[PDB]
Write an enzyme that holds these catalytic residues in place. Sequence first.
Site, PDB file in Angstrom:
ATOM      1  N   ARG A   1       0.827  -1.166   0.113  1.00  0.00           N
ATOM      2  CA  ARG A   1       0.092  -0.033  -0.029  1.00  0.00           C
ATOM      3  C   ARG A   1       0.960   1.346   0.072  1.00  0.00           C
ATOM      4  NH1 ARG A   1      -2.849  -2.590   4.294  1.00  0.00           N
ATOM      5  NH2 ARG A   1      -2.367  -0.845   5.810  1.00  0.00           N
TER       6      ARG A   1
ATOM      7  N   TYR B   1       0.463   4.767  -2.000  1.00  0.00           N
ATOM      8  CA  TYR B   1       0.294   6.028  -1.543  1.00  0.00           C
ATOM      9  C   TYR B   1       1.569   7.119  -2.089  1.00  0.00           C
ATOM     10  CZ  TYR B   1      -2.222   3.136   2.123  1.00  0.00           C
ATOM     11  OH  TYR B   1      -2.995   2.484   2.834  1.00  0.00           O
TER      12      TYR B   1
ATOM     13  N   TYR C   1     -12.055  10.194   1.433  1.00  0.00           N
ATOM     14  CA  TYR C   1     -13.182   9.861   2.334  1.00  0.00           C
ATOM     15  C   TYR C   1     -13.031  10.157   3.913  1.00  0.00           C
ATOM     16  CZ  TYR C   1     -11.554   5.167   3.760  1.00  0.00           C
ATOM     17  OH  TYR C   1     -10.895   4.077   4.311  1.00  0.00           O
TER      18      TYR C   1
HETATM   19  N1  LIG Z   1     -17.922   3.476   7.992  1.00  0.00           N
HETATM   20  C1  LIG Z   1     -17.053   3.719   9.020  1.00  0.00           C
HETATM   21  N2  LIG Z   1     -17.471   3.098  10.337  1.00  0.00           N
HETATM   22  C2  LIG Z   1     -16.298   2.889  11.382  1.00  0.00           C
HETATM   23  N3  LIG Z   1     -15.032   3.122  11.327  1.00  0.00           N
HETATM   24  C3  LIG Z   1     -14.872   3.362   9.697  1.00  0.00           C
HETATM   25  C4  LIG Z   1     -15.620   3.600   8.944  1.00  0.00           C
HETATM   26  N4  LIG Z   1     -14.832   3.914   7.871  1.00  0.00           N
HETATM   27  C5  LIG Z   1     -13.567   4.168   8.137  1.00  0.00           C
HETATM   28  N5  LIG Z   1     -13.446   3.793   9.456  1.00  0.00           N
HETATM   29  C6  LIG Z   1     -12.238   3.630  10.124  1.00  0.00           C
HETATM   30  O1  LIG Z   1     -11.288   4.214   9.226  1.00  0.00           O
HETATM   31  C7  LIG Z   1     -10.198   3.343   9.008  1.00  0.00           C
HETATM   32  C8  LIG Z   1      -9.681   3.578   7.538  1.00  0.00           C
HETATM   33  S1  LIG Z   1      -8.339   4.728   7.659  1.00  0.00           S
HETATM   34  C9  LIG Z   1      -9.086   6.146   6.989  1.00  0.00           C
HETATM   35  C10 LIG Z   1     -10.291   7.112   7.770  1.00  0.00           C
HETATM   36  C11 LIG Z   1     -10.733   8.434   7.101  1.00  0.00           C
HETATM   37  N6  LIG Z   1      -9.689   9.265   6.733  1.00  0.00           N
HETATM   38  C12 LIG Z   1     -11.541   9.064   8.386  1.00  0.00           C
HETATM   39  O2  LIG Z   1     -11.551  10.245   8.736  1.00  0.00           O
HETATM   40  O3  LIG Z   1     -12.247   8.427   9.062  1.00  0.00           O
HETATM   41  C13 LIG Z   1     -11.162   2.036   8.969  1.00  0.00           C
HETATM   42  O4  LIG Z   1     -10.106   0.659   8.952  1.00  0.00           O
HETATM   43  C14 LIG Z   1     -11.805   2.156  10.340  1.00  0.00           C
HETATM   44  O5  LIG Z   1     -11.275   2.126  11.582  1.00  0.00           O
END
Ligand SMILES: Nc1ncnc2c1ncn2[C@@H]1O[C@H](CSCC[C@H](N)C(=O)O)[C@@H](O)[C@H]1O
Lengths: 388, 388
Positions: free
Chosen positions: A66, A70, A92
Amino acid sequence: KPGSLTIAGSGIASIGHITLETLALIKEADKIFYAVTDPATECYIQENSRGDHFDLTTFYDTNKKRYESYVQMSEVMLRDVRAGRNVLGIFYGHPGVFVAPSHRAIAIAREEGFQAKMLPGISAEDYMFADLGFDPSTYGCMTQEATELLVRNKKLDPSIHNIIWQVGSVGVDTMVFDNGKFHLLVERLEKDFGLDHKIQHYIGAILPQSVTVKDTFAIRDLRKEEVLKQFTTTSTFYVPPRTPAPIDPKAVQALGLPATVTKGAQDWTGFQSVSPAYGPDEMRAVAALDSFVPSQEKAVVHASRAMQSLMVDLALRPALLEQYKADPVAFANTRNGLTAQEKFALGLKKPGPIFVVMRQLPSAIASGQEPSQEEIARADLALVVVIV
Amino acid sequence: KPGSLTIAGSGIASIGHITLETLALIKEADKIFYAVTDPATECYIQENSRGDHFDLTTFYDTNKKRYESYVQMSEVMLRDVRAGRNVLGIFYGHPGVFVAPSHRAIAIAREEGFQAKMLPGISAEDYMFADLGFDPSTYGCMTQEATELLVRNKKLDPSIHNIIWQVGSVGVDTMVFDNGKFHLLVERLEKDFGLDHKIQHYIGAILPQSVTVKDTFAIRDLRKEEVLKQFTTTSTFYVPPRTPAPIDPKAVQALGLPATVTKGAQDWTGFQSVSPAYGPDEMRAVAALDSFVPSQEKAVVHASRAMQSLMVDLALRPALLEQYKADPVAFANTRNGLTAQEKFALGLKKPGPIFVVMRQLPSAIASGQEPSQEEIARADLALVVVIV
Ligand SMILES: Nc1ncnc2c1ncn2[C@@H]1O[C@H](CSCC[C@H](N)C(=O)O)[C@@H](O)[C@H]1O
Ligand SMILES: Nc1ncnc2c1ncn2[C@@H]1O[C@H](CSCC[C@H](N)C(=O)O)[C@@H](O)[C@H]1O
């Protein structure tokens, strides 16, 4: 120097979590590079755009590191910046929370002398506090990546809130996620909290058809094959405190607070002792409500159409903001609907003057008495928790 | 039951941080109660609303216990819920982060049998990650309120990121903020980090006229009168790691990660060790970029206009979403522009089927080949950081 990089978020829930400033940027940006989670959000970004966009997720592969992906994500953005385009990156959630290529790209762009900015977005932790109904302030709150916690041999502190991210990808550096190393995290939890303590498995709803996942499991249950199945690359764990620290009477005294402070701010989840909603102190506050008259007259909002229209413009139109900042007196001259006072305030390009002109005492409004030039020029936060 | 409570945020920056779903709710709510920090945001809320609103900050007073004000804020919202109104509460930032009356009102409404929901907003921490340019995941990140840290006699961990909120209100339970107890926080910082360690004083920009505060101070400096005086009720401190823990080679092994990897996810702030943007690993990744071809075909977004229109509607119109959840098959039947596959997927009211119909392989797209009833019925995340 032509060319800029702005990196923003899309939040977690499809479309709804996007901020107004971010939608504005989507519409105006020269080129958008994005990494999002659901097709409706992806389509929404494309269709609101100027039609020049690129899916950053095309750099992943099953057995590809990964980290390599990146670096490439950062690089395609920087190339277009170098080409003198106004580049928008969208990730996201919040684009700076558990995201490597965003901070990387911003630092490189600034080092090469381009303007670069990150905008905040709604994180998975933000979604969690809303969905699970706890406040990080009540006990304090530690955020950690599951693999990070284990690689540095850290312990979890059982007296605070703990949030553990990426629980579904323990030890994984590619794109194959089989939960083969999940047991290492279970072992950590067992050591720190024991087998009986309960954690919360959280997946915030991404689509309208999603339902919030907020299941509770005892640590002992995390070994069951049927439970393990549920932990995906989206899963986050909330671990509520097992042993919240007691008030230190010595510290309370040193802070000059009442000794009869037996309590911190209330947590409502039901994981700790659940104190009645309407005890004596609450009853008293409620009884006093209708009667309460403030010691001093409070200001109310009082702004011209011209003032409000301009202030919205500056919030939502980066081109207009740049011009205002460059030459505020000239800018304010553009808007002849402004009162004399407002025009003066805006010329100073300071926050304090804005509050003086946009908020006035009812008494002064009734009198027709406007703020003096001196009151405007000289000017300059609601606290909404108390731990006591 | 008639009556609902929705509590949302406005974010930190004037207007621009508001989320799309929040603006939609402002436009539709019967009654809005708000506690915001600037007059442009206040006016914007008022002007987008149906014109029934109430300023929660009316309940504060100089020598009045803030807790009493918070009980009253919750109560005015609850009265309208009980009256059968669709109530919207709005607090600046995220409404559940360092906010007492929101979680209280939601808990009480729920216990009384009313529908209640919190929506996330952009927090001061969210703003900080973007402004100060760090990622909580790199070392782990502890959030705490200054007074709470002191009253529970907590120690700060110097190996992680630390964020300390409400530093300008240490030990204050009313509305007089004189910093008379700020020295107690300095003593704590001194014990945990020593005198030479640097912190960052952060104030995110609220108005177009505001400029970000991100000054660096050695802990030694925090006792100076001209420094101390800069710390207001808006101030937050970022305390970077002093001694980040080493990557444990034995943990690397147990985790199945590449041996002698010494390099944890990069922090770019300048507080940690300088590290080349374009080391050999990064250069190799950049060189490989142009000729990269994935090992298998990746799906792309592919949906009818009817599908995209509906998915946006469901994200931004709670009334439509409610009707959809009530009878998804019947609802889908009312949108006749959907493909037969889309209508089937939507009728299941499950997230997996939506992904199956809205993302399809270019090869299948070229054939007009659609997912089958069986593929849709049986349907079940980009990770954007890796800690090494
Ligand atoms: N729908 C969701 N519900 C709960 N945890 C979530 C999620 N989507 C992402 N995550 C969390 O984010 C991690 C990806 S890392 C990216 C996170 C994103 N930038 C943010 O601000 O949230 C996942 O492994 C999990 O721990
Ligand atoms: N503009 C700003 N910049 C930095 N920190 C801020 C801020 N506004 C609020 N804060 C932080 O938040 C505390 C108030 S508590 C309310 C926080 C709000 N709900 C949120 O989501 O951020 C302040 O004492 C400070 O620590």
